[PDB]
Chains A and B, each alone.
Chain A
Amino acid sequence: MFINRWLFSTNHKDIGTLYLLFGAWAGMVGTALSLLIRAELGQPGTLLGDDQIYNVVVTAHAFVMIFFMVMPIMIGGFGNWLVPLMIGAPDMAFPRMNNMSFWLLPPSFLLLLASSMVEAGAGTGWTVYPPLAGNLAHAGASVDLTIFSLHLAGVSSILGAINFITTIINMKPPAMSQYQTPLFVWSVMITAVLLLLSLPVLAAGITMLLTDRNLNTTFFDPAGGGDPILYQHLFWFFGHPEVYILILPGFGMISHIVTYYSGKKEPFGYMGMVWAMMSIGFLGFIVWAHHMFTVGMDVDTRAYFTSATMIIAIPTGVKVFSWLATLHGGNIKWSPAMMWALGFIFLFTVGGLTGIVLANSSLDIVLHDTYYVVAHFHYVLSMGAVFAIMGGFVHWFPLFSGYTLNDTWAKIHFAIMFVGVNMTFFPQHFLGLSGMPRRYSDYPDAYTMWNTISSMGSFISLTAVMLMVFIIWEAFASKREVLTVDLTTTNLEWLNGCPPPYHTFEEPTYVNL
């Protein structure tokens, strides 16, 4: 029975649970990598080694946080648990293929940990640029194991995207139009379209890198008439959509959390929220070369990418203002989830605005490949994507488990993490403006004060992560069973109880025209 249920699952809830467990474990690996980074940077001079072991750690940190923590939690975990419940569907369209999306991830992760154990690791950056990632400067198996890790993660997500799009289009109640689905459902549909279009281009690019490394192709090798810059275009054609894939499900969760803890039946400006997410998804495909402002492209190309990138602020601002307008007049419940969501709105806005600074190619000359970029993306990832994950986790934990968290412990957790992430990343703006480069194991002495404070921040965040484990233990240890949940009339995922039965919507919902 255990094998049938947990290795042979065709159940969206159990598969969601497997993704959440996987993502939680991946988060601990990513946190340990982040602490090794900050342990090295927290004092001038070399602690670990030369830049190779340091950049193996940096590279692994990014791949783990992105591919093994954020995507599996948001899409595999919250998506599998919530999407079918929010549309009244009895499962996913392809419930057996769903299981293979999950089981491809442990092998993908094993290939990444193999990459770090063999030879000297893949010290490439998560971008894996050639020629450093090629067979001369990174001879041996490490980069090939990294490429194969990404192939398995990519197939996982492509099949997951096919599953989500089909489920959301095809398995709603017949009276329910797309304009009567909850915003989280829209956020997953749009994320899935981005995955479907972007990951195959990554797959093509890393396959070319594999053949350059092993079959004597020269896509990226000037000796054969190749171009390292071609790899960058193919990578970033995926990579910019990838960051929208990381945030969009977060935007969907924030819309549900702000609505719920405002005591509202509905988010402000539903159709504007739908418009905003589709506009962000679309614009996310036409901006990739803002990652390449220093490579030597033509001025008119730089002018276009500056302008197109800045345009994303308009739909994004509609979402931020619509969240504020959802709070407006609310009966505010100061739940731990609400605290995560309010932290998100502010800290995501700050990171989005430093992105607008970077979109300016003239200023990006000085900021590119500095800690200013690192500050930007950690505000949107470590304070945006992560805050949406923590808000959704504490909000929906009672649905998934049938047990309550200790709200006082959860508020303590939030307070510690808020201090730690801000202490970690705020000073990195100063390091960037003053010229500290990325991917350095060591820095000139002038940069010591801000690196010291940043590292102290990272230790506060570690304390928060350890406390979160304890808080989940205390909930399962105490077994406070859920009795009543407010606002079920506008939150269908709660209406089958906590936890919902294995099979829900065996008899579908009745919705007339």
Chain B
Amino acid sequence: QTHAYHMVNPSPWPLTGALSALLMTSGLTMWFHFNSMTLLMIGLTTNMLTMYQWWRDVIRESTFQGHHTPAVQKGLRYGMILFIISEVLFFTGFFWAFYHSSLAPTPELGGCWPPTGIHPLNPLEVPLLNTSVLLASGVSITWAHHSLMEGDRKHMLQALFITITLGVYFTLLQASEYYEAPFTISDGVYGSTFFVATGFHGLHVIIGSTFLIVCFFRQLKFHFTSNHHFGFEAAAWYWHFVDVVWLFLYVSIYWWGS
């Protein structure tokens, strides 16, 4: 070959991933309707195995085999931006649902927002703390990025550890707020919009934290150079996305919706 692009070795992970999607969806069907978690637990297991081996192989191809030329790296940058755009439009659907319900509250709610019988969380208590936590994590991840570009291994690891700690703190605070909330997902469209929008956000925080932990262990193993570290850049972009979604949730659901 005399181009710079990556011809990938034939791989089983696309098929295992597709079958994991069949097992998770047929598994959710079996859980919702036939009172059984068996297929779902097989699908989640095969999905985790597939993700692990697929991304392991991308690290082998890049760090170990040198297939990530600038042209390949530029493709991955576009791929991650486009993926983030698709996730923004997914959240847009949930914001649309929220504004539709809250701007024109129906007679069943008492014709008011919040609905009769809903006692919202105080946005100045744990939700404000959660806001400070994710904003702080956007600062610490930026410190980590600069440390890596400047060749500073110890400060990169410290800044990334702080970022992950804050992601975990957010997740534990949200778990506690879920438990303490006097309203539930079954509390009409208020509970529906609140828990589905914040719940998909929480999942994305867990995904983003996991991505940052992968970057932490790769950094511990010296995979990143001061100039070549796309996995870290992608995790940082994803992490900023999770921050920005939170700020929109905070202003929309917790503050303006209270």
Contacts and interface: CB of A to CB of B under 8 A. Distances in A.
Interface of A: 4-5, 7-10, 89-91, 93-100, 102-104, 106-107, 110-111, 114, 140-141, 144-145, 148, 151-152, 155, 158, 161-163, 165-167, 169-171, 196-201, 203-205, 207-208, 211-219, 222-227, 230, 233-234, 237, 503, 505-508
B52 interface: no
B196 A208 contact: yes
B146 interface: no
A141 B30 CA distance: 9
B7 interface: yes
B86 A200 contact: yes
A208 B188 contact: no
A145 B54 CA distance: 28
B11 A225 contact: no
B181 interface: no
Contacts of B106: 222, 225-227
Contacts of A106: 18
Contact of A201 (B22, B79, B89): B89
A503 B106 CA distance: 61
B190 interface: yes
Given A166-B78, A219-B189, A222-B108, A201 B3 contact: no
Contacts of A167: 75
B21 A107 contact: yes
Contacts of A226: 101, 106, 188-189, 192
B2 interface: yes
Interface stretch (B91-99, B148-156, B221-229, B235-243): B91-99
A32 to B, nearest CB: 24
A40 B92 CA distance: 42
Contacts of A213: 32
A163 B83 CA distance: 10
Contact of A141 (B2, B29, B109): B29
14 contacts: A4-B10, A93-B75, A93-B79, A104-B21, A107-B22, A158-B86, A162-B86, A170-B78, A203-B90, A217-B186, A219-B189, A225-B109, A225-B188, A505-B3
B29 A197 contact: no
B10 A144 contact: no
Contact of A503 (B7, B14, B87, B93): B7
B12 interface: yes
Contacts of B185: 211, 215-217
Given A196-B85, A203-B90, A211-B196, A166 B29 contact: no
What bracket does the count of chain B residues touching chain A fall in?
35 or more
B15 interface: yes
Nearest to A156: B18
Given A203-B90, A217-B192, A226-B188, 10 more contacts: A10-B10, A96-B14, A141-B33, A162-B83, A163-B79, A196-B86, A200-B92, A219-B101, A224-B192, A508-B3
A175 B230 CA distance: 26
Contact of A200 (B5, B74, B93): B93
B65 interface: no
Contacts of B22: 107, 110-111, 152
Interface string B100-127: 1100111011000001000000000000
Given A152-B25, A204-B92, A224-B192, A144 B33 contact: yes
Sorted from nearest, which 5 A-B pairs have the closest CB atoms? A204-B93, A103-B18, A224-B188, A100-B14, A148-B25
A233 B126 CA distance: 34
A227 B79 CA distance: 36
Contacts of B25: 107, 111, 148, 151-152
Contact of A204 (B54, B94, B109): B94
A90 B108 contact: no
A7 B12 contact: yes
Interface of B: 1-3, 5-15, 17-19, 21-22, 25-26, 28-29, 32-34, 54, 71, 74-75, 78-79, 82-83, 85-94, 96-97, 100-101, 104-106, 108-109, 115, 185-186, 188-193, 196
Contacts of B12: 7-8
A216 B32 CA distance: 12
Chain B interface helix/strand/loop/mixed: helix
A219 to B, nearest CB: 5
Given A9-B10, A200-B87, A214 B32 contact: yes
Which interface residue of B17, B89, B109, B191 has the most chain A CB atoms within 10 A? B89
Contacts of B85: 196-197
B7 A225 contact: no
Contacts of A170: 71, 74-75, 78
A111 B26 contact: yes
Nearest to B116: A225
A204 B95 CA distance: 10
Contacts of A111: 22, 25-26
B28 A148 contact: yes
Contacts of B83: 162
Contacts of A97: 14
A377 B40 CA distance: 39
Contacts of A7: 12, 15
Contact of B7 (A90, A98, A110, A141): A90
Contacts of B19: 103, 107
Contact of B15 (A103, A114, A215): A103
B111 to A, nearest CB: 10
B94 A95 contact: no
Contacts of A505: 3
Contacts of B91: 204
A144 B74 contact: no
A104 B18 contact: yes
B79 A230 contact: no
A208 B96 CA distance: 12
A162 B85 CA distance: 10
Contacts of B71: 170-171
A505 B188 CA distance: 58
Contacts of B88: 200
Nearest to A201: B93
B5 A90 contact: yes
Nearest to B1: A506
